Design an enzyme around this catalytic site. Structure first.
Site, PDB file in Angstrom:
ATOM      1  N   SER A 296       0.745  -1.195   0.000  1.00  0.00           N
ATOM      2  CA  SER A 296       0.000   0.000   0.000  1.00  0.00           C
ATOM      3  C   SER A 296       0.795   1.274   0.000  1.00  0.00           C
ATOM      4  O   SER A 296       1.468   1.519  -0.973  1.00  0.00           O
ATOM      5  CB  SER A 296      -0.967  -0.175   1.133  1.00  0.00           C
ATOM      6  OG  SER A 296      -1.918   0.854   1.103  1.00  0.00           O
ATOM      7  N   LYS A 321      -1.145  -4.473  -3.210  1.00  0.00           N
ATOM      8  CA  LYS A 321      -2.304  -4.001  -2.549  1.00  0.00           C
ATOM      9  C   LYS A 321      -2.579  -2.549  -2.894  1.00  0.00           C
ATOM     10  O   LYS A 321      -2.108  -1.681  -2.162  1.00  0.00           O
ATOM     11  CB  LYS A 321      -2.045  -4.185  -1.082  1.00  0.00           C
ATOM     12  CG  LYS A 321      -3.055  -3.419  -0.252  1.00  0.00           C
ATOM     13  CD  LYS A 321      -2.743  -3.507   1.230  1.00  0.00           C
ATOM     14  CE  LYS A 321      -3.818  -2.849   2.098  1.00  0.00           C
ATOM     15  NZ  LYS A 321      -4.956  -3.734   2.391  1.00  0.00           N
TER      16      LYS A 321
END
Length: 387
Positions: A296, A321
């Site tokens: 992320s 992600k």
């Protein structure tokens, strides 16, 4: 032909209709579903309407796109850092049809970690209760308890569904130290950039993105710059992300000019973050260590460094992600948890899919994260060829 129920149901479809990151709606016709649903689904009480919304949601196949009844959208507003304890686990859903809840990354120095739990591990059961198909909020609720408690957790190494490990873990409040840093001296020839005027490397461990991160990183780069180190080692392995603005922040500490990240959806770019011309060190050679536990906001950072050519990416392909969710409030106090956006590297790379790939394919575990340890390895004759 109006109802209170229909209205509510429509608010929920609309939210999605309007915010969902993928306007192909898992290849369903969102507008036709509406019809179908108003037509065939019982909406006689709010409870039923709630179910229909839930049903509706699931066609999407996005585990982050969920319905929130008014109780959770309360329970969920702010608050869990508090008197509530867990086992240093950071969870998320699997790769394809990700029914599966996995360890994103285990809190470094956490009870789960100090017990054998690794990034990529599949969560099988917490206390005997299977977890597949379950909410994260739900799963966290099983993970969570109080100080001094215990909880047994059964995992399995990815792809090794039989390879099962049971972990009885003791509930502890786990603070993750955002950053660690040092200078490594007498560094080995093999790990030194090519132009090194000095056998020193600045190593920085950046374990998470939080409220403290920015200040802790500014510290590290500042000091290291001062030391006049030959090269920089940014290690963001096993770093789940977290605070996005902190990611940009650090990125702007190393990158003086250029875009850093693009925020997009179905329809195209929605936003862009660029450097402000205020970096701390835009010039020392930098290698960035990543692994599959890098996710992320940490991947955003990886892609910024990489696409800017600010730094080399070493290690293994990151998490993948890249989705951004949000909660849309319904008029009756409920909410819709929706993925509305996605991160992309400056070069057009879709984080979520692909992940950030290394420039220097390395054997990611080469380096420890403890300071003494790290320098030793770097001072070793077998030191890794970082650059």
């Amino acid at each position: 032909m109006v109802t209170s129920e229909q209205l509510l149901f429509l608010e929920a479809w609309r939210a999605v209709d309007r915010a969902y990151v993928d306007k192909s709606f898992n290849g369903q016709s969102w507008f036709k579903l509406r019809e179908t649903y108003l037509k065939k689904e019982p909406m006689d009480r709010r409870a039923q309407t709630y179910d229909a919304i839930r049903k509706l949601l699931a066609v999407l196949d996005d585990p982050f796109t969920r319905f929130l009844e008014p109780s959770r959208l309360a329970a969920l507003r702010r608050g869990t850092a508090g008197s509530v304890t867990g086992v240093g686990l950071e969870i998320t859903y699997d790769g394809g049809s990700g029914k599966d809840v996995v360890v994103l990354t285990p809190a470094p120095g956490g009870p789960a970690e100090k017990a054998g739990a690794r990034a990529g591990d599949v969560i099988v059961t917490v206390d005997g209760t299977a977890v597949k198909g379950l909410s994260l909020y739900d799963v966290s609720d099983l993970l969570q308890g109080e100080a001094d408690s215990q909880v047994e957790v059964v995992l399995h190494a990815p792809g090794a569904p039989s390879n099962t490990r049971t972990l009885q873990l003791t509930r502890q409040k786990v603070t993750i130290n955002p950053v660690t840093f040092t200078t490594c001296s007498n560094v080995a020839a093999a790990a030194l950039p090519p132009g090194a005027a000095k056998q020193q490397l600045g190593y920085v461990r950046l374990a998470t993105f939080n409220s403290n991160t920015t200040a802790a990183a500014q510290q590290a780069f500042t000091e290291l710059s001062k030391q006049g180190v030959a090269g920089l080692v940014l290690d963001i392995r096993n770093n789940g992300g977290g605070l996005f603005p902190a990611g940009v922040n650090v990125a702007r500490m190393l990158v003086d000019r250029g875009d850093l990240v693009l925020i997009a959806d179905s329809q195209g770019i929605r936003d862009i973050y660029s450097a402000d011309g205020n970096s701390i060190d835009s010039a020392t050679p930098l290698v960035v260590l990543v692994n599959r536990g890098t996710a992320s906001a940490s991947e955003v950072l990886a892609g910024a460094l990489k696409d800017s050519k600010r730094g080399l990416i070493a290690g293994e392909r990151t998490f993948g992600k890249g989705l951004i969710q949000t909660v849309v409030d319904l008029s009756d106090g409920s909410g819709v948890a929706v993925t509305v956006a996605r991160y992309q590297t400056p070069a057009g790379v879709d984080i979520n899919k692909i992940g950030v790939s290394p420039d220097v394919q390395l054997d990611p575990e080469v380096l420890p994260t403890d300071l003494e340890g790290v320098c030793r390895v770097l001072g070793s004759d077998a030191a890794p060829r970082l650059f």
